[PDB]
């Protein structure tokens, strides 16, 4: 039981600047609501469904087979999502790299890479660490824009072929294969989080910052934002929509107990995500006394935000080395064990539908490896931070809100919710109680359609700090969003039309078990019936 123990790096790196962004407090509540009304739920739900078809992503819609371009669409923002995660574990290799002297790099206004405005003690960016970020890391400053990123840096170059070269070869051989970083993951973050938070408990200042983060603004409230990216990064930090969960229960005994697991995984992020808001804002707030500034313009609310704050609290530190290798080696085993997780969802879904795959997985892994590596190129030039933002904002929002609101409105009006009730109880011995069955039918699914209704509604234009992107750059990130949208209704057409009868004969096809077809010739379906629908 220590997969449900281990740490998320979305609990770590993306909550902090989510949390920032929407103003401290007035984010908890939206988080919450969500984590109880739809995150636990359809989690319980891709798990029991896993383990009890024994299938993965495309192919466990076997029981309803109008069903399948779901499977396709999570299998995409899976391959979307990767395309930018190991930029972040590059990061973090390269800093590791420069954490092995006595004299840390972003402490002092020195060094080659410093503007002449660097104060050594709108947003505010003449800080040695925001320094240390931004020019002798990214190189930002060569960069006028996403229409002028110009050409890869050669050492991030480098550290990309190291994270995918141990990609490769920790998946070349099949699943399972002695998971070691699991047992990393489910003790070393703990022990850091716990250190940083009391440390930073005392830091002066850090009083502030608990405060405004224990503050809750009601009027920030009652507006879109907070609610879509609460609603995101519930589903982000879970797992649901992806295909990672299906896949990887798809191996579980049949007898294994979901609703343990669902319970302990949601109790662990939540406390997590909870600890490392507190931490962020005690930083936050010791930063802001330090500095002179306001807290609402002390830092950036992109996705480089904990590169900043970390080192600026280790420094902090007696024997500040030894803190920045752990955290550091903490925060690679967290984006290594992440990764894998995806790698391994996109090659069993598609590995599954296609027989032909599973004799050449070592081929089949080099071509998903080298495809990563070859689109993930694009995020490490020098306006590589634009196109990073531009595929967390479009890659998995709406378009994951939509494909678990498929998903869920599948399983429990089209198959059955008492069918998946008592496929449940045979393999672990108990039915489900009346609130996770009018979670599964009506609760989740009209949360789900209303949050997705207001993005749609409500989306604001593209910026990143002070710059603001062209309207292509928009153009472009709905066309990437809609690209797995648009798999659903497309697979409905052609199921549709390469069945051969009338509309009642495919009609009643396309949603029976691929099991159960003999009952067609018999004119016995139960979905033409009011029961069926009636049933809760
Ligand atoms: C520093 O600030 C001045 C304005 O006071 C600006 O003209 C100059 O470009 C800045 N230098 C850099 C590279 O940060
Ligand atoms: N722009 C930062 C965000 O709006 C924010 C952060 C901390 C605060 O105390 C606040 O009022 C607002
Ligand atoms: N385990 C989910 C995580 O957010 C993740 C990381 C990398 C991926 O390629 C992916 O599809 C999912
Ligand atoms: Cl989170
Ligand atoms: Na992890
Ligand atoms: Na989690």
């Known amino acids: 039981s220590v997969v449900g123990f281990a740490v998320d790096l979305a609990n770590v790196w993306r909550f902090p600047y989510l949390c920032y962004k929407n103003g401290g407090g007035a984010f908890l509540i939206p988080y919450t609501l969500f984590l109880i009304i739809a995150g636990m739920p359809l989690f319980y739900m891709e798990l029991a469904l896993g383990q009890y078809n024994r299938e993965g992503a495309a192919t466990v819609w076997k029981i309803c087979p109008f069903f399948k371009g779901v499977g396709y669409a999570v299998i995409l923002i899976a391959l979307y999502v990767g395309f930018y995660y190991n930029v972040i574990i590059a990061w973090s290799l390269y800093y590791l790299f420069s954490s092995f002297t006595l004299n840390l790099p972003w402490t002092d206004c020195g060094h080659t890479w410093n503007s002449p405005n660097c104060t050594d003690p709108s947003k505010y960016k003449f800080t040695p660490a925001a320094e240390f970020y931004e020019?002798?890391?990214?190189?930002?400053?060569?960069?006028?824009?996403?229409?002028?990123?110009?050409?890869?840096?050669?050492?991030?170059?480098?550290?990309?072929?190291?994270?995918?070269?141990?990609?490769?070869?920790?998946?070349?051989?099949?699943?399972?294969?002695?998971?070691?970083?699991?047992?990393?993951t489910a003790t070393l973050p703990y022990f850091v989080l716990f250190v940083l938070l009391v440390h930073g408990v005392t830091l002066?200042?850090?009083?502030?910052?608990?405060?405004?983060?224990?503050?809750?603004?009601?009027?920030?409230?009652?507006?879109?934002?907070?609610?879509?990216?609460?609603?995101?990064?519930?589903?982000?930090?879970?797992?649901?929509?992806?295909?990672?969960?299906?896949?990887?229960?798809?191996?579980?005994?049949?007898?294994?107990?979901?609703?343990?697991?669902?319970?302990?995984?949601?109790?662990?992020?939540?406390?997590?995500?909870?600890?490392?808001?507190?931490?962020?804002?005690?930083?936050?707030?010791?930063?802001?006394h330090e500095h002179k500034v306001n807290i609402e313009d002390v830092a950036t609310e992109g996705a480089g935000l904990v590169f900043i704050l970390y080192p600026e609290a280790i420094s902090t530190l007696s024997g500040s080395t030894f803190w920045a290798v752990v955290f550091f080696v903490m925060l690679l085993a967290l984006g290594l064990d992440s990764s894998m997780g995806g790698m391994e969802a996109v090659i069993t879904g598609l590995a599954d539908d296609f027989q032909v795959l599973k004799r050449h997985r070592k081929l089949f892994t080099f071509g998903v490896t080298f495809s990563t590596f070859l689109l993930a190129l694009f995020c490490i030039t020098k306006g590589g931070i634009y196109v990073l933002t531009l595929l967390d904002t479009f890659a998995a929002g709406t378009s994951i809100l939509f494909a678990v609101l498929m998903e869920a409105i599948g399983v429990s009006w089209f198959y059955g919710v008492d069918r998946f009730s008592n496929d449940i109880q045979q393999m672990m011995g108990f039915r489900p109680g009346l609130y996770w069955r009018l979670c599964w039918k009506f609760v989740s699914p009209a949360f789900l359609l209303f949050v997705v209704v207001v993005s749609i509604i409500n989306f604001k234009p593209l910026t990143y700090d002070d710059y603001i992107f062209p309207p292509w750059a928009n153009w472009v990130g709905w066309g990437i969003a809609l690209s797995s949208m648009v798999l659903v209704p497309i697979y409905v057409i052609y199921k549709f039309l390469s069945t051969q009868g009338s509309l009642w004969e495919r009609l009643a096809y396309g949603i029976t078990p691929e099991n159960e077809h003999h009952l067609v010739a018999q004119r016995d379906i139960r979905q033409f019936q009011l029961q069926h629908w009636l049933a809760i």
């Open 135 to 184: 020019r002798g890391v990214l190189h930002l400053h060569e960069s006028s824009g996403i229409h002028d990123i110009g050409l890869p840096q050669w050492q991030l170059l480098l550290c990309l072929m190291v994270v995918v070269i141990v990609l490769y070869f920790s998946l070349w051989k099949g699943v399972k294969t002695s998971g070691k970083v699991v047992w990393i």
């Open 204 to 288: 002066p200042g850090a009083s502030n910052g608990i405060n405004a983060y224990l503050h809750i603004d009601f009027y920030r409230l009652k507006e879109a934002t907070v609610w879509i990216d609460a609603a995101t990064q519930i589903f982000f930090s879970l797992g649901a929509g992806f295909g990672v969960l299906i896949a990887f229960a798809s191996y579980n005994k049949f007898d294994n107990n979901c609703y343990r697991d669902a319970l302990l995984t949601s109790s662990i992020n939540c406390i997590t995500s909870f600890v490392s808001g507190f931490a962020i804002f005690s930083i936050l707030g010791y930063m802001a």
